[PDB]
Every structure is written in structure tokens, then in C-alpha cells.
Amino acid sequence: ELANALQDLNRVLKTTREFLDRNGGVLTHDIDNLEQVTTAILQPEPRDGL
């Protein structure tokens, strides 16, 4: 139990750190752009237009 838990935790910490350092800036940018566009198209007048 504990041996596999520790080794897998170490591996997943390394994997998460690499994945974040690689993809986080663009994932955050995409989420912000999606939020901006969806908020823009869900304003009252665009809402009733849709």
C-alpha cells in the first residue's frame, strides 16, 4: 500500500509539475477567451436575439 502510494505520488507530482509548466499559460488564456466571448454573446440583447 504505502510503497506504491509514495512512488505513484512522486511520479504524479513530477507529471503534474511538467504538465502545468507546459500547458497552464495557454489553458488559462483559452479559458479567459472563452469566458469573454460567451459573456459577450449572453448579454440581454444577444440573449433575446439568440
Binding site: 500500500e1 504505502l2 510503497a3 509514495l6 512512488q7 505520488l9 512522486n10 507530482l13 513530477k14 503534474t16 509539475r17 502545468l20 509548466d21 497552464g24 489553458l27 488559462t28 479559458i31 479567459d32
Partner: protein, 51 residues
Amino acid sequence: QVNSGDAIQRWAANLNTLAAQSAQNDEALRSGLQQAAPTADQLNAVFSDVR
């Protein structure tokens, strides 16, 4: 203490097992702490960006 002798024997054996597993993975534990210090900061930064 006598009445719960089976319980104390059981947790002594389980302490032996868990301690052996933890000691045999000493380097894994050290690296886990070393990486757990900044990775939670990375996750917190990413989340606070998209908070």
C-alpha cells in the same frame, strides 16, 4: 492492556509493515516532499488565474 492483547499485537505487526514500506522508499519520500512543496504552489497559481 491484557484484554486487548490481540489488538496490540495486530497494530505492532501493522506498524512493522508500514514502517518497513516507508523506509524502503526513503528516496521516493524525499523526492515526494521536495516536489510537493512547489507543485501545490503551481496548482494554486493556475487556479487563481482562472478563479
